[PDB]
Amino acid sequence: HFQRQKLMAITEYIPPKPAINPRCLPPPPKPPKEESVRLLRQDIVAVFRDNRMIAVCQNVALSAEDKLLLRHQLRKHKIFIKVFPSQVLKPFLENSKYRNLLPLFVGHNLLLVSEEPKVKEMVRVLKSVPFLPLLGGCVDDTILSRQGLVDYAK
Amino acid sequence: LLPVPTFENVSIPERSKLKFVERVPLKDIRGPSTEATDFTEGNFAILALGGGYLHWGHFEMMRLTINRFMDPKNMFAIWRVPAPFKPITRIDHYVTPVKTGCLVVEMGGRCEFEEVKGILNQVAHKLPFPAKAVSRKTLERMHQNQRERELNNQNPWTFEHIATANMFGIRKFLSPYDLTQKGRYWGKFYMPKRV
Amino acid sequence: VKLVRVQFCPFEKNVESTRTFLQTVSSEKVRATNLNCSVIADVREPCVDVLFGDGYRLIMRGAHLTTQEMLSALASHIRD
Amino acid sequence: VCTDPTQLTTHAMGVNIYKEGQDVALKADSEYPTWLFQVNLGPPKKLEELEPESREYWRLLRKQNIWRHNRLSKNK
Amino acid sequence: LREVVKTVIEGRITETPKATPDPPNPSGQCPICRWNLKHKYTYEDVLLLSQFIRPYGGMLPRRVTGLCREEHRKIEECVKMAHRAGLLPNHRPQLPEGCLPKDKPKLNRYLTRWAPKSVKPIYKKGHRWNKVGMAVGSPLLKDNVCYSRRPLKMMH
Amino acid sequence: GVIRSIVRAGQAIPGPPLGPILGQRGVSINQFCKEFNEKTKDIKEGIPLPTKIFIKPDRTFELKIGQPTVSYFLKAAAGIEKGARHTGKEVAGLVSLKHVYEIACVKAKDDAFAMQDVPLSSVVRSIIGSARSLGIRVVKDL
Numbered sequence: 001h002f003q004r005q006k007l008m009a010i011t012e013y014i015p016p017k018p019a020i021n022p023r024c025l026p027p028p029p030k031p032p033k034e035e036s037v038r039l040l041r042q043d044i045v046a047v048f049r050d051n052r053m054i055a056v057c058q059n060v061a062l063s064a065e066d067k068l069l070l071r072h073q074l075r076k077h078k079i080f081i082k083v084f085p086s087q088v089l090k091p092f093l094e095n096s097k098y099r100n101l102l103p104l105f106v107g108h109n110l111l112l113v114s115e116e117p118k119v120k121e122m123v124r125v126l127k128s129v130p131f132l133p134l135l136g137g138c139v140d141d142t143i144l145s146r147q148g149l150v151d152y153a154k
Numbered sequence: 155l156l157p158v159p160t161f162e163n164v165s166i167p168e169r170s171k172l173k174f175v176e177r178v179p180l181k182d183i184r185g186p187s188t189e190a191t192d193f194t195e196g197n198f199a200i201l202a203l204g205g206g207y208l209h210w211g212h213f214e215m216m217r218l219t220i221n222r223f224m225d226p227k228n229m230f231a232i233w234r235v236p237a238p239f240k241p242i243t244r245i246d247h248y249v250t251p252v253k254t255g256c257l258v259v260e261m262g263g264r265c266e267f268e269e270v271k272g273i274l275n276q277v278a279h280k281l282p283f284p285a286k287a288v289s290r291k292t293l294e295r296m297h298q299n300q301r302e303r304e305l306n307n308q309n310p311w312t313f314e315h316i317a318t319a320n321m322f323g324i325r326k327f328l329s330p331y332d333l334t335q336k337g338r339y340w341g342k343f344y345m346p347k348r349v
Numbered sequence: 350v351k352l353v354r355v356q357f358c359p360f361e362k363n364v365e366s367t368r369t370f371l372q373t374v375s376s377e378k379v380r381a382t383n384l385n386c387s388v389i390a391d392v393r394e395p396c397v398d399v400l401f402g403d404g405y406r407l408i409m410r411g412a413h414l415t416t417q418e419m420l421s422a423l424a425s426h427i428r429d
Numbered sequence: 430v431c432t433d434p435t436q437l438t439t440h441a442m443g444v445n446i447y448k449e450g451q452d453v454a455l456k457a458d459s460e461y462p463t464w465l466f467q468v469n470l471g472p473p474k475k476l477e478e479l480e481p482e483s484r485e486y487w488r489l490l491r492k493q494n495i496w497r498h499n500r501l502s503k504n505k
Numbered sequence: 506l507r508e509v510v511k512t513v514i515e516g517r518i519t520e521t522p523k524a525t526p527d528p529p530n531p532s533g534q535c536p537i538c539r540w541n542l543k544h545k546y547t548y549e550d551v552l553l554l555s556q557f558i559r560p561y562g563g564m565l566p567r568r569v570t571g572l573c574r575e576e577h578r579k580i581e582e583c584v585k586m587a588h589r590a591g592l593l594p595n596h597r598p599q600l601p602e603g604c605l606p607k608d609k610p611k612l613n614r615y616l617t618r619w620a621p622k623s624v625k626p627i628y629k630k631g632h633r634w635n636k637v638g639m640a641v642g643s644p645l646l647k648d649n650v651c652y653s654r655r656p657l658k659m660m661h
Numbered sequence: 662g663v664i665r666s667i668v669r670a671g672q673a674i675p676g677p678p679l680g681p682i683l684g685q686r687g688v689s690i691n692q693f694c695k696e697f698n699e700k701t702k703d704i705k706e707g708i709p710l711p712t713k714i715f716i717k718p719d720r721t722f723e724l725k726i727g728q729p730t731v732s733y734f735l736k737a738a739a740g741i742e743k744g745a746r747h748t749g750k751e752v753a754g755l756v757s758l759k760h761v762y763e764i765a766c767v768k769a770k771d772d773a774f775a776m777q778d779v780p781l782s783s784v785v786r787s788i789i790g791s792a793r794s795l796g797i798r799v800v801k802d803l
């Protein structure tokens with residue numbers, strides 16, 4: 001019947017309207033941050049604290065197997081290829097000995113971590129791959145250029 | 155990351171496969187479902203959104219499809235409805251009447267809803283009545299959504315007030331059952347969005 | 350392309366675009382494709398110079414050019 | 430080849446099998462470093478056994494994360 | 506905004522026009538939210554629309570604009586309506602090398618939801634209860650403020 | 662192109678498993694066997710060896726070989742030539758600590774198979790896992 005249909009239309013549910021849409025909302029507060037990733041903090045903290053001077057060089061499209069071979073090669077140089085995912089590298093400065101080394105660790109780059117000032121061994125590592133660019137060496141955890149690294153190394 | 159869910163506590167009965175349904179044995183379907191409205195063993199099932207008649211072929215379609223696809227190691231299936239008994243004269247076949255909101259098949263085991271969504275939806279499409287695959291979480295959300303819409307309704311006039319108060323003499327043009335349905339059920343069909 | 354030269358200063362302000370462009374050029378698959386290329390990276394504003402045998406030299410500075418622009422320009426040149 | 434349990438348990442029969450390599454006798458347990466016999470001989474380290482702050486813990490957890498994706502992928 | 510001059514090429518970063526200071530509603534997540542313009546713009550408001558469109562009439566990326574998706578679809582639809590109505594003479598499509606217009610007359614249109622090219626004619630109009638409906642306007646603009654007694658007839 | 666095979670050193674011309682598969686890319690089958698025969702003389706004959714042959718587009722051979730498979734040795738150590746149908750729970754041999762460790766010490770000599778880890782925990786897991794793959798249970802003592 002038509003008359004019954006009229007009753008249904010009037011009884012139709014009416015939804016309320018929010019004052020502001022979620023996208024156009026005023027700035028709301030956000031939950032406090034949580035460190036999930038926490039394991040990786042310990043590994044990077046140990047290696048950087050152990051090694052005062054770090055030579056930062058961009059990583060060419062190297063193979064995983066070569067890195068182990070290069071890791072053994074550095075053992076002859078008394079240096080260690082210890083690397084981890086870099087998306088946890090940036091928060092390293094947030095929770096570590098220093099907070100100001102973020103600009104040095106920009107992008108994906110090979111890190112040569114050595115605790116001793118064996119300049120010749122570090123220079124030899126540079127000689128291994130010329131095409132691979134060495135960003136620089138933070139001798140005594142002080143920011144420096146590649147040319148400066150050699151100058152201070154002298 | 156967070157720990158992954160586990161189904162170790164779940165136990166699969168030996169009779170993983172569905173049992174056979176016999177070919178052969180008045181408002182049975184024109185009303186709200188009063189039986190098999192609660193999850194018994196499994197966390198997933200099929201919920202009838204309308205009143206339909208399930209013949210032997212439908213049971214075989216459910217039985218054959220479920221048995222072939224289900225994994226006995228991690229899945230089990232049970233029947234939530236009786237065998238067909240209502241004759242359809244040409245008798246060509248017999249059917250099982252179903253009411254709106256009846257759970258027809260319930261499956262459980264060490265599986266997620268998404269794994270069974272595709273098969274259950276395919277079975278639901280092949281069913282003679284409108285149906286929707288349901289789970290314990292999804293079913294509660296439907297009720298929670300149903301409650302939320304009812305609670306926040308802004309309509310000054312409601313179906314119950316007009317019907318119970320006999321305003322306009324509406325009860326003269328309404329059936330006795332309509333009072334119980336409250337506008338959510340019409341004939342053999344159920345209106346989920348009617349709040 | 351017989352030679353490709355990429356120069357940038359990491360200690361000073363270093364543009365990501367030029368540095369990222371270096372990675373794409375210095376790839377095991379990219380290098381194999383343009384086998385003729387001799388990959389040389391200069392490490393010390395950034396200037397990228399590519400030399401061709403025909404005499405076409407294309408110089409790209411990443412200070413205001415993204416890696417895509419260099420890649421788009423280089424890709425057409427390589428086809429020749 | 431050796432066919433004596435005593436020789437099997439007192440001599441390194443399986444250490445070398447070539448003709449250039451002759452079966453060498455077993456030195457005393459103390460003659461080897463402690464870490465040789467302190468190696469993990471138990472079942473594979475489960476999430477409970479693994480230390481939450483160890484790389485193996487997350488490495489195997491990532492392997493488990495692949496399994497669920499593979500399980501979902503297999504069903505497709 | 507960077508423009509490239511061109512082989513040796515040089516790219517110069519040039520000054521970009523700045524937004525007028527003191528938005529009416531500061532702290533709005535989107536510029537429309539900032540300017541309280543959620544439901545007060547239409548396709549005829551070319552001045553606002555032109556700012557978010559490429560010089561040749563192409564859509565600018567959402568990320569650069571920073572406005573929310575809801576306004577992005579609304580703005581894009583409004584601009585689409587303006588182009589089909591010939592309301593953007595200076596943002597017309599670029600002719601690639603030497604092409605010229607067909608020179609045939611262009612029919613005057615407005616409130617065009619879809620391109621006239623892909624719409625088939627309606628031979629059978631239908632009776633009173635079977636009448637076919639002709640779309641007018643866009644669904645994206647339903648929420649816009651209405652100054653009429655009854656909601657606008659989307660289908661004519 | 663790296664192709665991995667486990668063929669035994671004793672037979673240098675298995676046929677289908679090596680000859681045409683390497684030949685399909687285009688290589689000299691006779692040349693492959695001769696170098697493999699050179700490996701056969703150095704190594705004990707009749708023991709499976711993993712190979713890491715690389716077939717370059719230049720139709721050249723880059724043959725690299727390592728230690729004999731510990732998997733077969735575990736099968737030989739357990740006195741098993743053909744294992745059980747499943748081997749997931751079927752077991753015919755038990756290996757003690759001493760036998761496990763002795764082979765591992767020699768194992769750590771090849772640049773291949775990542776046999777450079779200072780801790781021996783990595784080495785034991787592969788052989789322990791290999792035993793799980795085989796129809797062998799590595800019990801501590803029996």
Ligand code: FES
Nearest residue numbers: 023024535538573
């Ligand atoms: S008006 Fe605020 S997000 Fe659109």
